Structure formats: C-alpha cells, structure tokens
Design a protein around this ligand. Structure first.
Ligand SMILES: Nc1ncnc2c1ncn2[C@@H]1O[C@H](COP(=O)(O)OP(=O)(O)O)[C@@H](O)[C@H]1O
Ligand SMILES: Nc1ncnc2c1ncn2[C@@H]1O[C@H](COP(=O)(O)OP(=O)(O)O)[C@@H](O)[C@H]1O
Ligand SMILES: Nc1ncnc2c1ncn2[C@@H]1O[C@H](COP(=O)(O)OP(=O)(O)O)[C@@H](O)[C@H]1O
Ligand code: BEF
Ligand code: BEF
Ligand code: BEF
Ligand SMILES: [Mg+2]
Ligand SMILES: [Mg+2]
Ligand SMILES: [Mg+2]
Ligand SMILES: [Zn+2]
Ligand SMILES: [Zn+2]
Lengths: 415, 214, 668
C-alpha cells in the first residue's frame, strides 16, 4: 500500500499511523530550526545530569533536581539547562499541496503539513513535485476550544523518504548508468536536431523555434571577470506571433521539460507575483519575505504568456530581471535586493492582434527598444496560409487526434 | 443525510436516473437519420428559427472529447459559441435556456462578474490566503452563459484567454502558485458596437472584439 | 587528561600551546601558508609579531586583542587550537584571555618597567578572534552547529536602543537593612529566603531594589544576510545580532559589516502562558568581532562619523572604524600623485571592464572624491556631494557602471525605479517580531548617507516618487513630518542615476531636453548630465567587440586592457586618504574663471542656473582633491567646465535649436 502514491484528499483518517506516500506540489518550506527532543539540565549541587524528554510543541522547565539525591536528601539542587548537552534535531514544517490532476471536478486543492526532521532537511524546496513517503501521525487539536467536540486530532506527515519527479539540474552526477544512457544518446547521432524535434512532438513544422527553445534550456555560460563585471549567460527568448500558432502549447511543453519554471500569464495576477513583499511565517514567527513567481523560478524558465497584455509596472521589473539577474526592492518595510537568476520565455501577440504587413515590424511588435534589446531571439511566427503547409498541418493534427502520438513513424521522440 | 441540491447557476451538477425504459427509448430514437434535426428543434421550441444556432448549442451540450497525451499536452475538447446580433434577436433567451437545461451551467452578466469574479482569485482570508473559485472554476465540466459580452471590460476579457484555450487558471499571486482546472464551455451574446449590425461596414468594425478572442 | 567534560579542551595543553604561539609567531609562517613566498619581506616578518603587538597594546593601554584565526592555523604546534577555538569558543576564549593576562604580566616584569604592576593588574583583557573560516551562509547551519564560532557578513538594517542587563542584584531585608549581593549564573540570580547573615530569618524578608543592582549594556542589531552563495529560490534572510560591552553603538544602520560570533539557540516563551516554552528554539548570533573596514570598498567617510568618533573614544570600543594608512603606502600615494597621467589612470582604474567611456568614468571618479564639506560656523553648511545622471541609449554599460560604483562605495543602496516608493525611501514605520512594538527604520536614502545611492531606471520611476529626491538633492537632508514622526534627517547621499531617453533610443530630431524628459527643477539639480550615445562607428564597434570577445577566451579571465590600471585596494586607499585628510579651498584666479564660465554659459536647451555654478565649484573642488592639492587652480575650473560641456555634448548640440548633429557627436 505504501507503493501507491495518494492524493491529499485520499489521506483519510483510516490511514493514520501507517506508512504512506503522498504525491503533490510543495508550496511552503520553513527554515531549518533546532527542535528539542530531550532537554538536558545540569544540577551542580549533586553533580547529576537530568534529561527531560520533550514530545510536543511546548514544554515546561524544572525547579527541583528530580534525581535521586536531591529528591531524597535534604539538599535541594538547582538545575540549569545546557544547550550543548541537550539533544536537538534539524526540523522543517513543509506543506505539500494537491496537484491539478488529483483535484476532482469543481473543487480546489487542499494541503497537508509535513514535518521534515533529522538529516532529511533541505531535501524539499518550494515548487517541487515530489512523492514524499512518511508516517501519518496525529497531533493534539490546536484550534479554538469552542469548535472542539471530543478528542479532535490535527494530523501531519513525518517525512521518511523523498522522491523528486523532476530531478534538479544542480544535482547531476555522471554515474556509470547515467553515463550509459547519455552515451547511447550520443551514439544516436544528430543529438541537436533530435532533441529539438523531441520537444512537443505534437506540434508540426515549427522547428527553428524548437531549436531556440532547446538553446534556452541549455543556457550560455555566466562570466564573472576578476574586476566584478557579470554577464547574464542565459538566453531570453520571445515568441511574438499571430494567434493560433501554438505558442502557449510550446510554453507548456517547455514547462514540462524544464525542472523549475512558473507559467505566469495574463495581467493582474502578475502584479503581486513579482512584488515579493514581507510576511510572518507561522512556524518560527520569522518575518520571512515571500518570493513572487520570478524568485520561485530561480535558475529556471519564467514562461511568461500573453506578454503584450501584461501591466507596464511588471515590465519595469522584467527589465532588471533580464539584465542584472536580480530584483532591487526599496519599498516600505523592505530594503533588500532579491537574487533571481532566471531565463525568461515570452509569448505574445503583436499590436492590433494579427500582424499587419503594411505596418513596420517595430511599429507592430510594440516592444520598446530597451526591452527588445534584452531578448536574444525574437521570433515572428507569422501565419501565412499555403495550400501545401496547411494540409501538412491538417494531416499532422488529425493524426494526433486519431492516435495519441506524433505522426512520424521513423522518428523517435526522446523521453 | 446530506443532499447536494441542483439550482440554476450553482456548482452542483444535475444528474438524472436512467431507467431501462429510458435507455431503450434513447437507443431506439438514436437510430433515426433525422435525429440531429429532431433534437435540435427541441432545444428552443419557443424561439422561431435560428435552427443552426440551436444545432450548435446542442453540439456544445454534447461537447467533444478532450485529449491528454503522454508528454503532458492537453487538447481542448470543448466548443465555444458566440452570438452577435441586433437587439431582441432572442440571444439572451437562448442563453437562459442553456442555463436552464444543462447539467452544470453558470450564468454571468457583462461586468457584474469581473475578472476577479471570473476565473478565480485569492481572498486573503485571515483564517490564511485561501483560494476562492470564481465562476469558470465552479463551471468545470460545464457551461458558462456569459451575457452582454460586448459590455465586458477589456481587462476582464484579458483573463479569459487561458480559460478559453488552455482550460486552466493560473494564480501565481501573493506567493500562491496554483493551476486550477477550468474545463468549461463558454457561450456569449453581445450586440454590435453600433447597436445594429452594419452591412455597409466590414465585420471587423462591427464586432470590435480582439482577434485572439474571436 | 583533566579535560572539560563534553569538550576536547585541556586547560594545561591549551594554555601552553597558546603561549608558545604568542611567543613564537612569525608572519613569514603565514606568508608561507598563504603562498606569499614571492611577496615575503623578512625586513618585518622575522620580528615577533604578537609580542610586538602586545607591547604596543601595553603602551597604548588598549584592553582588546584582535586575534586572527589563520595566524593560529599557520603555526604548526597550535594548529589544533584553531579547531578547539572554532568548536568551543566560550571556554577557549576564556583560556586565551587568561593566557594573554599571564603573558602580558610576564612581558612587563621581564622588561622591568618601573611603574606599579597592580595599577594595570585590574583590567579585563578580552580576545576578539575573527576570520574563522568562510561564510558558509547561514541557512545551512544545522542544529549540531550550536555554540560554534561562525563568520557572518551583511547589511545592518536597524539597531535597538541600549538595553540594560542585570548581572548583580541588590536585595535588602527591610527590617534589618542588610544589603544583599548575588551574582548571575546562566541568567538566574537566586532569591534568598532567609538573610545572608544570622540577624533574622523570615519567609519574605528582603525586597529587590532594581536601581541598586548592577546593569551591563546589551544592544540588539538586525542584520540582513548577504552570502556569497545562495540556494535557488531563496529570499534574503535576517538574523538578530546581539552585542555587548564596548561594541554597543559601534555599528550604525546601513553598514556592510563582517561579524564573527557564537551561534546561539534559546527557548522562547508562549504568549501570556506563564513559563511554558515552545519546543522549537529561536536562533540568534552573538558578537565578538566586527570588521567594518574592507579593502574591496572605500573607507567610511570621516566627516559623517566625526561626532561619533569622540563618543567611541569615550567608550573605547576598539573597533577599527577607519583603516589606517601605512607610511610606505603614503609614499606610494605621493609618487602616484606625482604621475603625469594621474587623471586618466585613476579614471580608467574605475570600472576597468568598461571600454571607451572615459568622460563618464571621469565624472564617476570626481563623484567618488567629492567637493569640500565646508562648515559655515555661523549657521548652515554646504556638502561636497556631486550627483550624476546618465540618460543614454540602451546597452551602453550604464547599469554596469552603477553596479561597480555600488560595490566600491562604503554605504550604497541599489534601487531600480518601480521597485521604489516615496515611503520606501526616506524612513518608515514597521513592527518587529521580537519586541512586537512599533519601531522606525531607514529607507534607501538614509541608508545611503555618506555614500552613493545608485538609482537605476530613473525615467520609469514615478513623478510622485521623484518628488522626495529634491530635498536630499539640494540641501543634503530630508525633513519628514508624518504620522508619529516629526524630525529632520541628514541624508548626505550623492545620487547616481541611469535613465533611458524617452522612446528608449535617443531621437536626433527632438532636442536634448525633450529626449531627457525631466522637469527643469529636478534636471537642474543634477551636477553632470551624461548623454551617452550609441553611434554605429565601425572602428569603435570593432574594438569593443574585440575586447568583449577577448573577455570570453578563458574561464576566469584577467581583464584585457592595453594600459595598466591601479589595484582596487590601492585605489580605495588613495580615495579614502584624499577624502579625509585633504580639504581644498578656492583661489582668486579660480573664482574669476568660475564667474566668467558661468556668465558665458548663461547666454530650447536647458538654461544654466546657480546650481550650475555650485556644480562647477564642487567639480573644481573634487579635481583639486584628486591631484592631492590643498588649493584649486584655474586649470581645474577649466577642466570642470570642459567636463560639463562634454557630458551634454555641447559641441555637437546646435547653439539655438538644441538639436544635436550626428556627424560631430562621434566619440573616441
Ligand atoms: N503548428 C501547430 N501544431 C499543432 N497544433 C497547432 C499548431 N498551430 C496551432 N495548433 C493548435 O491550435 C490551438 C492553438 O493553441 P495555442 O498554443 O493556445 O495557440 P496560441 O497561443 O498561439 O494562440 C491548439 O489547439 C493547438 O493544438
Ligand atoms: N425569433 C424569435 N422567436 C421567438 N421569440 C423571439 C424571437 N426573437 C425575439 N423573441 C422574443 O423577444 C424578446 C427579446 O429576446 P431577448 O433574448 O431578450 O433579446 P436580446 O437578443 O436583445 O437579448 C423575448 O421575449 C423573446 O421571446
Ligand atoms: N562600452 C561598453 N563597455 C563595456 N561593456 C559594454 C559596453 N557597452 C555595452 N557593454 C556590455 O553590454 C551590456 C549592456 O550593459 P547594461 O548596463 O546592461 O546596459 P544599459 O546601459 O542599457 O543598462 C553589458 O553586459 C555590458 O558589459
Ligand atoms: F490566440 Be494565442 F493564445 F496567441
Ligand atoms: F437587446 Be438584446 F438583449 F441584444
Ligand atoms: F537598455 Be539600458 F538598461 F539603458
Ligand atoms: Mg497563447
Ligand atoms: Mg440580451
Ligand atoms: Mg540599465
Ligand atoms: Zn541535584
Ligand atoms: Zn533581615
């Protein structure tokens, strides 16, 4: 039963105490703080170390040495805590969330708390898609007493093992097995074109854009000269084009291949998704800053959709994110400079929707010269009908619908 | 006992019991060659004509098949219908009937349901940062009957593109990164900007909707 | 054996090894360790290092010995003392304090100084180690790293008022009038039920008199982390520093410091639940050493902290507020000033990576020096800050220049347009988690006091936000009158701003003013306005491309420049010394030249105002300081006028139209 990954909704009260595997996205991870397992007190009058076990969120210190002599003799020894002698453990109150696939029709995702303890800390980061396996243990009720009716229990999941659905780029070791899967890819020949056609096989005839997106995934090389100059070393791709040329599906495909990346889209929602303001964490009472979409997409791909229909206020921040790879915030309560190393992919429509060939490309792209400069590649993806390409696309799409697979028989889309 | 009750423009779907007699009748009636015409006529007996519109509405109620592929791409299996025309053309009547006959339908007006009202948005509840499902999320696997589409704010219609095509609502707001599922079929009615459709002017001038939305 | 339970520390072995290290430390050992054999100078490496230092410490009377960790690492026999101190800072530091006391007594007695030994006997000698390993960050500190000496560095956001700390409490049995004395042991001062003597025995006999008790000083400092390496998706953190004794008020807000201390975790009390502690401990860092002065940055301005220097002398904090200048280094400063191309060399040593932007690099250097901070003793003052605006075409390296300035300057804050707000700058009100009471913090402008506030993307910033700039821009102070706060704040901050001309690209058709698109009040305040222009010049573009490509030849490239540039450390030394010793004054010939230039200038394009005269005065003062002169001369005023003319491209500008001819706007 531990093999089967369960959604948060399926973690009923029946599964309490067992070993279960919950599959979902990670939204909030607290800082690592020392949690008391056993607290050690020193009583110098009788020279005894007394250890009080702690098994709750709170506890109470002692006043009289409860060891044999001080409780037995007339001597009443004063006992003092010793942090170094006491036992601690690295602790993190994560919070997993239900995926979009697991949520039933019409509901909204619900979350489950995870208490990561011991050496397993720092194995979970926000935005990760993981199958955490742990012990579904109960805890005493922590809400308001009036709502309590009987021995109500709050529940959590004590993490034991973490499996990442999408492995991080910074965690690559060329182990012999990874070496063999890799050289088998090398021996396939034409790795560049095969990888380019591999991404989003259901999309036909847009191959240069796929190559550009592959280059976006690979990324250049960051240069930090001895003086202090830093070059971006990452590509910022744009996909300006007419409606109905599968820009959004390319962006979603890239989101699938990329290990980390937010699919920020539209307007209004982005306004607070780049603010990165300050809020108090419930677990440690720390006033941790909250990161927006861009910070969560650090060392990832920002996959901004509907770029042209998005507020100028956020474009001002996109300027600095693209160039300096950092976000400088000096608003009320915050005087720091966030670190957001991101590669931005933008899909947008030209001014007046469909491209008008009569107008000049700059007048129709509508990007200011400063913003357009930051885009390494700005595709046009113009829709120009033709009796041949149209029927090619139609046959490809009809094959995709009639069989859930790319039409190309001889081609091998890499997993 | 708890009985979820179906009411117009509510999230509760309206399922019905199919007796063996009813299934037999359905199977027998499906054999006729004029089944499409027979059904289409029955959508709005009150409204005269508009038979092609009624056929389109019936096809919307049936819907298509959404396709999910291994790589993760999702292909829309829902069809959206927009009616533009002169006043008193029974467009609002057709919308009301669709609301009254679909298993799960949600009715909205032009600007009463803003962009926050549609899709979804964070409520910032003090008991913290809960998510509240707007109209389209609550209309998953259902229909949204938008009326007076032309009066809609430009900003409101910006947020509708993703729900129309990708069938998802992405929050990415206030530290909340979520992708709600909104697989809704949208039907809208909207008069032309000039009150009555102008044959002398091209349809681009009359509709005044963005090319992507059309 | 005889080790402390729970530690590998043995008092005898530790004392002996530390004494051997103190007696027998040669800096040549460290130079050997640090691969400095090519740089070894036995003219000063052979002499006893800590012995001479302790002799100086005895002569001056200072009570604090700043010990270097790598010094302990280098000497082979005391290598283990490094790990012992790193793992057990408290006991080891106490042992070092005792060893310093003993060795200082031995040094005094051996030399047979005549003065009485007991006069200096009663004084606590504290050792303040530092440079204990790399930063490691802070979020990576597992709970197994409790009470271990660690190295942290970051900005100082805010500091609490000094909080008294009771160490000795005074009770008094009211009937018997017997004073009581109890010390502190792990934060508790036991209440005696009966009296200390045998006069009387009552259950509640004595009462605490807080005022009679002994209180020590404790200040809480909030530091914001700036680690070298940050994990993906991590926002900047914040750790609460706690300082004691002479370190109180040593650190002001906005100071990029490098603090060494002991990691500490403390149980926290539940809200209004008497004497119930949450299991999750709260972590804070103690403070033993603070390294304000760094060789990668200019030294803190002496003028701003001049008043606080006397209070520090009263406190004898012994923090190195300002780096000291070595004599041979001063001679090197003099010889470099004697160079003919001092001006070009210093200009190009600022932002070495940038290519062919000499006029802009110059102005930046003149800003880094600054004009004379004249003090009108009758009332009022004039500050020598120079503000620079860079309105230019995209991809002209302006943001990189701002980044370099922000790195170099001692107290600088980087800001970018819409990421700023009026309340965001200046000062605001906020609530701390720990006190849960309202406090006042500092915005970017106040944190930039005595430094450069690099304001990026100026034009995108709102007209509302730019309004507050005028006050600090002209008279170098900000006077706020808001809900709960009514005061004046001196923000002596030199603003550096980068902007894109409206349209994102300079329009040759529209005049300079219309392209720049700033209100005349705000535009006039800027001393220098640079019209950086990107023109398609085949030779210049080829050279820039060759330079940038050569930057990519090797992984960690040394900069590819034809001409030699000064070390950044030496440049910081030069700039600091020139700023703090030398205060140039104006001459009659310079006065006449200034008047003539101002008159000729005031004869569409922006009209020169008296702010232009003040900018000329401050630029002449800055140039005087650069050459190390104590007076300014007419050639310096002419150079300042030439810089003002060149910044706006006055030669290529049409005289009366204000339009710029593109044929003559070409640069080097
Ligand atoms: N070249 C193509 N290959 C496959 N499907 C395509 C192609 N062009 C358009 N489509 C289809 O057209 C629709 C447009 O998808 P979407 O990515 O939302 O378009 P856009 O964002 O460009 O407006 C989708 O159903 C998509 O599958
Ligand atoms: N073709 C029609 N057949 C029957 N009734 C109609 C027809 N056209 C309009 N009506 C009637 O006219 C009125 C206006 O219809 P309504 O849907 O409100 O118009 P609108 O298109 O302006 O929204 C209704 O009472 C409707 O029954
Ligand atoms: N003259 C130049 N010298 C050195 N680097 C330059 C120069 N012009 C452009 N660059 C390089 O091109 C980029 C543009 O610099 P940046 O400051 O980001 O542009 P902007 O001036 O628009 O803010 C940087 O990587 C910078 O190193
Ligand atoms: F109409 Be598409 F989403 F650019
Ligand atoms: F007059 Be209708 F409701 F278009
Ligand atoms: F395009 Be630059 F940031 F002025
Ligand atoms: Mg799209
Ligand atoms: Mg109507
Ligand atoms: Mg810039
Ligand atoms: Zn005891
Ligand atoms: Zn008494």
């Amino acid at each position: 039963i531990s093999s089967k990954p369960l959604s948060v909704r399926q973690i009923k009260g029946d599964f309490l105490g067992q070993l279960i595997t919950v599959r979902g996205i990670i939204t909030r991870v607290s800082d690592v703080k020392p949690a008391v397992e056993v607290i050690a007190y020193t009583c110098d009058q009788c020279g005894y170390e007394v250890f009080q076990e702690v098994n709750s969120r709170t506890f109470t210190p002692l006043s009289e040495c409860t060891s044999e002599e001080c409780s037995q003799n007339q001597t009443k020894g004063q006992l003092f805590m010793s942090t170094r002698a006491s036992k601690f453990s690295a602790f993190q109150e994560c919070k997993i969330q239900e995926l979009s696939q697991q949520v039933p029709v019409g509901h909204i995702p619900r979350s489950l708390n995870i208490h990561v303890n011991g050496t397993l800390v720092r194995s979970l980061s926000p935005g990760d898609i993981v199958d955490v396996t742990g012990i579904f243990l109960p805890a005493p009720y922590t809400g308001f007493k009036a709502l309590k009716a009987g021995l109500l229990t709050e529940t959590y999941l004590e993490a034991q093992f973490v499996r990442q659905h999408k492995k991080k780029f910074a965690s690559f070791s060329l182990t012999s097995d990874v070496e063999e899967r890799v050289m088998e890819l090398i021996t396939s020949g034409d790795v560049y074109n095969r990888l380019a056609k591999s991404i989003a096989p259901e999309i036909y005839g847009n191959l240069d854009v796929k190559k550009a997106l592959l280059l976006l995934l690979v990324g250049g090389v960051d240069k930090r000269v001895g003086d202090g100059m830093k070059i971006r070393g990452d590509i910022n791709v744009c996909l300006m084009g007419d409606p109905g040329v599968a820009k959004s599906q390319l962006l979603k495909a890239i989101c699938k291949i990329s290990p980390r990346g937010v699919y920020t889209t539209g307007k209004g929602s982005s306004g607070v998704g780049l603010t990165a303001a300050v809020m108090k964490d419930p677990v440690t009472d720390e006033m941790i800053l909250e990161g927006g979409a861009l910070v969560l997409a650090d060392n990832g791909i920002c996959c901004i959709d509907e770029f042209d229909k998005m507020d100028e206020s956020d474009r001002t921040a996109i300027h600095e994110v693209m160039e300096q790879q950092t976000i400088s915030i000096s608003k009320a309560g915050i005087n720091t400079t966030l670190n957001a190393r991101t590669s931005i992919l933008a899909a947008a429509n030209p001014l007046y929707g469909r491209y008008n060939p009569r107008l000049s490309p700059l007048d129709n792209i509508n990007l200011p010269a400063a913003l357009l400069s930051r885009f390494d590649i700005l595709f046009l993806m113009l829709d120009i009908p033709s009796r041949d390409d149209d029927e090619k696309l139609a046959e490809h799409v009809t094959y995709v619908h009639m069989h859930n697979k790319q039409p190309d028989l001889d081609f091998t889309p890499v997993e | 006992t708890v009985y979820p009750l179906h009411a117009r423009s509510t999230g509760v779907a309206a399922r019905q019991m199919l007796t063996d007699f009813d299934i037999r009748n359905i199977n027998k009636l499906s054999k006729k060659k004029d089944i499409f015409d027979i059904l289409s006529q029955s959508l709005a007996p009150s409204i005269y004509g508009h038979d092609h519109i009624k056929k389109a509405i019936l096809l919307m109620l049936m819907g298509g098949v959404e396709k999910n592929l291994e790589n993760g791409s999702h292909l829309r299996g829902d069809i959206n219908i927009l009616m533009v025309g002169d006043p008193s053309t029974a467009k609002s009547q057709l919308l009301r009937f669709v609301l009254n006959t679909a298993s799960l339908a949600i009715a909205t007006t032009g600007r009463g349901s803003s962009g926050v009202g549609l899709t979804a948005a964070v409520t910032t509840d003090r008991e913290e940062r809960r998510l509240e499902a707007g109209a389209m999320v609550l209309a998953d696997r259902g229909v949204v009957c938008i009326d007076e589409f032309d009066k809609m704010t430009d900003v409101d219609r910006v947020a509708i593109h993703e729900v129309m095509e990708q069938q998802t609502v992405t929050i990415a707001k206030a530290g909340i990164h979520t992708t709600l599922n909104a697989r809704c079929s949208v039907i809208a009615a909207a008069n032309p900007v000039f009150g009555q459709y102008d044959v002398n002017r091209d349809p681009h001038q009359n509709i005044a909707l963005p090319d992507s939305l059309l | 054996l005889r080790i402390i339970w729970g530690t590998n520390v043995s008092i005898q072995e530790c004392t002996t090894n530390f004494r051997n290290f103190l007696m027998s430390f040669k800096y040549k050992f460290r130079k050997i360790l640090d691969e400095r054999e090519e740089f070894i100078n036995n003219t000063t490496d052979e002499e006893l290092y800590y012995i001479k230092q302790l002799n100086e410490m005895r002569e001056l009377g200072t009570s604090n010995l700043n010990l270097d960790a790598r010094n302990l690492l280098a000497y082979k026999q005391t290598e283990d003392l490094y790990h012992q101190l790193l793992n057990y800072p408290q006991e080891v530091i106490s042992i070092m304090d005792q060893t310093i006391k003993d060795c200082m007594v031995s040094l005094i007695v051996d030399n047979n100084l005549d003065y009485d030994l007991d006069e200096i006997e009663t004084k606590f000698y504290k050792v303040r180690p530092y440079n204990v390993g790399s930063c490691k960050g802070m979020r990576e500190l597992n709970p197994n790293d409790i009470d271990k000496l660690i190295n942290l560095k970051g900005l100082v956001l805010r500091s609490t008022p000094v909080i008294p700390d009771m160490k000795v409490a005074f009770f008094k049995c009211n009937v018997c009038d017997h004073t009581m004395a109890v010390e502190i042991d792990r934060g508790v001062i036991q209440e005696p039920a009966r009296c200390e003597r045998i006069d009387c025995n009552e259950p509640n006999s004595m009462s605490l008199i807080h005022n009679r008790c002994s209180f020590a000083d404790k200040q809480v400092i909030k530091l914001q982390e700036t680690p070298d390496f940050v994990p993906d998706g991590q926002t900047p953190h914040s750790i609460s520093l706690c300082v004691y004794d002479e370190l109180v008020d040593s650190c002001r807000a906005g100071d990029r410091i490098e603090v060494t201390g002991t990691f500490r975790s403390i149980p926290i009390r539940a809200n209004s639940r008497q004497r119930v502690l949450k299991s999750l401990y709260k972590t804070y860092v103690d403070v033993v050493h603070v390294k304000k002065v760094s060789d990668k940055r200019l030294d803190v301005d002496t003028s701003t902290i001049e008043q606080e220097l006397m209070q520090n002398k009263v406190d004898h904090n012994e923090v190195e507020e300002v780096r000291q200048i070595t004599d041979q280094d001063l001679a090197k400063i003099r010889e470099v000033a004697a160079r003919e191309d001092l001006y070009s060399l210093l200009a190009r040593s600022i932002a070495p990576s940038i290519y062919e932007l000499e006029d802009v690099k110059k102005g930046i250097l003149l800003q880094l020096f600054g004009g004379t901070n004249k003090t009108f003793t009758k009332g009022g003052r004039y500050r020598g800050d120079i503000n620079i605006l860079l309105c230019g075409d995209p991809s002209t390296s302006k943001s990189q220049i701002l980044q370099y300035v922000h790195k170099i300057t001692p107290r600088g804050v980087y800001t970018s347009g819409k990421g700023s707000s009026a309340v965001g700058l200046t000062a605001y009100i906020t609530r701390d988690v720990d006190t849960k009471q309202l406090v006042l913090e500092s915005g970017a402008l106040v944190l930039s006091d005595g430094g450069v506030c690099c304001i990026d993307e100026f034009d995108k910033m709102s007209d509302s936000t730019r309004s507050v700039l005028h006050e600090v821009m002209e008279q170098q102070t900000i006077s706020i009158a808001k809900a709960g706060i009514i005061t004046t704040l001196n923000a002596r901050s030199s603003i550096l701003a980068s902007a894109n001309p409206i349209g994102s690209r300079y329009n040759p058709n529209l005049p300079v003013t219309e392209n720049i698109d700033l209100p005349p009040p705000l535009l006039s305040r800027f001393d220098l306005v640079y019209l950086v222009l990107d023109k398609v010049d085949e030779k210049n573009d080829r050279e820039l491309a060759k330079h940038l490509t050569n930057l990519y030849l090797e992984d960690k490239p040394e900069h590819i420049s034809q001409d030699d540039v000064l070390p950044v450390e030496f440049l910081t030394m030069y700039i600091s010394y020139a700023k703090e010793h030398i205060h140039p004054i104006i001459t009659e010939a310079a006065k006449t030249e200034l008047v003539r230039a101002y008159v000729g200038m005031r004869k569409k394009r922006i009209t020169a105002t008296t702010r232009q005269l003040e900018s000329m005065i401050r630029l002449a003062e800055a140039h005087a300081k650069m050459k190390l002169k104590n007076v300014v001369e007419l050639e310096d005023v002419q150079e300042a006028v030439r810089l003002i003319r060149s910044a706006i491209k006055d030669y290529a500008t049409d005289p009366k139209t204000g339009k710029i001819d593109m044929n003559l706007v070409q640069t080097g």
